[PDB]
Amino acid sequence: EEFDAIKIALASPDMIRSWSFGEVKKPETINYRTFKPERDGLFCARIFGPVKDYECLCGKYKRLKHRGVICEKCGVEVTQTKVRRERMGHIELASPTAHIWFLKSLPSRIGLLLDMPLRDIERVLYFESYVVIEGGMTNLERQQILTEEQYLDALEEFGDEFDAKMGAEAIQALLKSMDLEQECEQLREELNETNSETKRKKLTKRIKLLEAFVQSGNKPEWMILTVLPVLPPDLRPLVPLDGGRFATSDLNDLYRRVINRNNRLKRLLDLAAPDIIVRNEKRMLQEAVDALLDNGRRGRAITGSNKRPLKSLADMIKGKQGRFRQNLLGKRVDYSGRSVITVGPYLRLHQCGLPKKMALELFKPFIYGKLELRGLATTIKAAKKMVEREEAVVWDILDEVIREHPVLLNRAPTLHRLGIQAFEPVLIEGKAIQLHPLVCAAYNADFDGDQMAVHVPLTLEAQLEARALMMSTNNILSPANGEPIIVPSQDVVLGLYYMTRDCVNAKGEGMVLTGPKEAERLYRSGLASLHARVKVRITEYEKDANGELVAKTSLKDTTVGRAILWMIVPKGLPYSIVNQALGKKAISKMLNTCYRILGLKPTVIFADQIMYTGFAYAARSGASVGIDDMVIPEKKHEIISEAEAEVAEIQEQFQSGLVTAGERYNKVIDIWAAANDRVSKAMMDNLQTETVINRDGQEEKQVSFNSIYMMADSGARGSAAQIRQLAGMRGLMAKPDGSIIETPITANFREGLNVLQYFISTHGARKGLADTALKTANSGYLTRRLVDVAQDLVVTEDDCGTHEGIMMTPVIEGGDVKEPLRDRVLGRVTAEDVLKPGTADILVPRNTLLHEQWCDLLEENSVDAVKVRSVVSCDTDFGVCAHCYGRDLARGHIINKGEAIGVIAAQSIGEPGTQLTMRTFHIGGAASRAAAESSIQVKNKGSIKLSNVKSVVNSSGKLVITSRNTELKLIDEFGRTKESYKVPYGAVLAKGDGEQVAGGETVANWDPHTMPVITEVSGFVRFTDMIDGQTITRQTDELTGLSSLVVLDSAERTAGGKDLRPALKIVDAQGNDVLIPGTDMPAQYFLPGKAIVQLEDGVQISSGDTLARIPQESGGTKDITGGLPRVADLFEARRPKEPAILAEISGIVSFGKETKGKRRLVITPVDGSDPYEEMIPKWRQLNVFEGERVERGDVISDGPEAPHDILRLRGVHAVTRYIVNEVQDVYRLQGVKINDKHIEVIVRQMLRKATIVNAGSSDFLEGEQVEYSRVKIANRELEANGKVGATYSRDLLGITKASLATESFISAASFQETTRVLTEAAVAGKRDELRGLKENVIVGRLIPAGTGYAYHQDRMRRRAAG
């Protein structure tokens, strides 16, 4: 049996007959009385096999003795009953029947083959109209439809010498007569003469179809069914329920439909019935077969018993619920259990509490086995009865089996790999699973009723894979980032915080101790507080140049709780780690440091110790939460009455006339948002310190030990944001629309919320909860699309030996460098030997791992940019090299060859999204969004550097910017870039280019609300095309009458103004056009949707003035809800509604033709004589001006860039870096750390395919799409041997299409669109050789990765011989 590949192809009528073991003539199932199969019925034993093992129906032959003995009397083979699941039958159809899958499934094969529209074919099939099959007399040609009356006319006149028919016989004849060869040549001849752009595609597609049809060896006639296969009985079973009733598959109802109508058709043919009735029966027969194959595709599905449509054949394969997703890519599993989880703080990190009764059952065979080796059990049934009786000796045996046997714990949902971990079990009395606290983070396990799956690895191999790869201890670091996942929390944090943190004097201030032991003795004796500021003598052990630890001892001011923690601290670590007051943030660093210095076993022990000491001192403290905790500020009511009269004055000014709904909304929200921060900061000063404690004599200030303040400052639970709502002011609440309520909640929980404030709260709350239920599914669907696309990607090679790589620079987004170069390049293979500034001595090699030690050296030299080897630029065909990837972030060393990288990438991108969906949503009530960014103040002195900027000087003296992309940088002395600052359009700069500014100077102010339209030229203002009511609107005031103009866009605009662009035009005193300095462009500024102009026509402007104000309403939430669709849009490589344009070829450009306003930018290169001419929208305005020597992919247009255009012109590293940065923008906004290398994996999978120009020595020709690896392989052998050279161009595929473009149809089918995938594979006669992971998991084989990579590579070499 063991096979190489699988192929799919159209079934021949005769092929179908081969599988069949008889024709089922009758609809009879079984006999009502003897519930045995009827004669030649659907469950016929004569056809499908015996009902009972080695027994004929009439009962003449019994027992295993009779083997293959076909009983003469009843006609039933004496074999196993198993056969009735494998043997098929068939049905002889009277009329040929079209196979819905090839007819209806778009595009369709029957239609595309005949070049005949579907409508025409259907009219033929339902017997509405005749079709001409062939007429030697060109009078009627081919495939020309004739109605009932059209058929009568030609029939008298010509007749006979022209053949036209109706129904599936007609189409089968038409398919039989069609010559695939000749039409191929005719269509090639057409493309040679006149290749029209869009119909070249469709002609090339029918050519590919015809070619592929002939290569597959499929025949078009076979699309029409003459023989209809019958599924084996056990796969459509009729079984008796206990109640005496029977229950059956709906396939039985569909087969019975088909047989009844088919047999009735045979009858009406024997009876010579009139043709109207024959026709009706042929329609009904096709309806029944189409229902049986795919019910609901051919229109209204056939409803059975309830009214629900009958489940057809295709429905069992297709749906998510089909067989692929449900029974094949995942399954129900033996030696599996579940229960509620609960803490096991006593456990070590590699252990878990497993209930006695649960473990008894899971390890049943293992017990039976030892019982028989000890001779305590005579046999298995006696062993089973000893377990049933739960005898005392059995417990002792079970304890012996479980020893050193790992068990897998799993929690839903399994978002990333740490959702499964292996533990050594600890037998426990009681029904709950005990989980180690430190792994609760990876499972996202909280013990308010969550449950876990248990699974038992049976084989020695599976035990070892669990202990080595999947063990808790061994999966410490997150594979998505370099930070660890196992980190103490809650009490473990509170207790260590309580121990380390210092208090004024207390018991035994300023004593001296001999080491931590005198300290612990003092504390436990009751002569010292843990916050006793005293100096102790601790002995630290630092590592020297060699492996040896160098001894060191010295004195240092500290406390009595930090010295005692030093006792837990392993040798190698500095004392400075425990010398601060420890929080969760500091302890995570402590365990990571310990892991990288000392190694795995020490950190494991250290982690346990920290947990034990944590809770030990947590219960020794005894902190609680009272009503005196939240202390609301004395100066709340003042701040509020001030804020409240202020907002009142603006509401009175609203009836006066300076205010729109949007303006006042912004102004009131600003007032309350600043009041809330003020009251919060009042509360936090009053609470954080405001500790008056008398030091040894006089008064002092120190930090408050108020309980809630300690909870917040420690990071144990609530944040400052929660405590604002407790003790300060609750703030502005946001409606389910996302728009914020104008009246904020002045009160806090302590004071008490009313029914109005509470009712208003509810909106936000419930939208949050609904968000968790509903939104969770798009996140998860993105994980699944990612996984499917990057399943194949495995580490295949150690070193491809590539120099190529991406230049990484410190990510200084905004003002402060959130992530520097060290973190971004931390653990990355360095290529193209990059040394220090002074180019005269190599600092780093071209084949080394970027380790923390190398990274520390990089920082002394301050290297800004480094070319590093990346996954995207790796040359390895059919996988990636360990060097291009770099460190396995989860392991902390170079990646192992055979590791399934793609999966890890998809999971690690996918997880945060899916977790941040449920997470931020249930946890938040209101929306604490900030928007103070409206004026750049510089933090450190330096000189202003403005890259990409075109500004005009205004009458103020000031530099008013009119560039779109503007980057203000802060250079020091030496000349490095250190701060960045995105200046907007419409900005006032304080100082111009390259001018000195001091620390804390404002360098540019701009309004955040309103992006003004700022004019370059000076003169008078003219209203072009600005017809009132057509394009704008007029709104008038009282006494004198100030009118204001609002530009209605095409949304509100009439049909009349649609074609008019409204624009403020600059004319001079004469009323001639003023030019834009130095160009032929006349000044004219095109006003968009709702551009609210105050100043009416004819007003003398100066340059640099604000013409028009476009309302910039930013009413969007700062959540993943808005972020994830951006992430999905980048991964799926979507062109925006306004993608930027770039030069295709280098060379010198002038303008040619214009369509009214639409630019036809003509590039005429220097060397390359052929031009490149582009149509461009009128309103899209160019960055470039005219004759410049611009290279390939210079930015011409504004607005967002399409990843396609980036790849196509600049190239791989450009587009990869665009995706990485644009995605990472979103995740970084939510505080999510994902390494770039994961995103890079998936982009590599996006850039899998490439289109080809010209031919080589293979079958390329014009514009075939082939995978990049395979064309490179061809190019390698070509370049050595010669032959026709082939130009190529890489194509970008966004995720969904990239996954369907994989050359495995088992993966394509299992993903989505299964019906369409199998028709296209069946027609192509496609052969799946089973190379990817999903394919191997489907056939239930060893994965080509991890453990399986060894075995799999041995099979690939067994292909070379034997």
Binding site: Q490, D491, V625, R717, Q722, F749, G925
Partner: protein, 50 residues
């Protein structure tokens, strides 16, 4: 009787449970005074006063 974790309050922002606990103790405080007066019989007049 029960030891519950302080850290499952300020994050959860259900402060009701803490007020319930303070009042619950006060309620039981007064029940403990009545229980003490009933154990020592004392006066119907005095119980009535309290």
């Amino acid at each position: 009787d029960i030891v519950l974790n302080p850290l499952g309050v300020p994050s959860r922002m259900n402060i009701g449970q803490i007020l319930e606990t303070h009042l619950g103790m006060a309620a039981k405080g007064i029940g403990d005074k009545i229980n003490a007066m009933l154990k020592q019989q004392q006066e119907v007049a005095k119980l009535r006063e309290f």
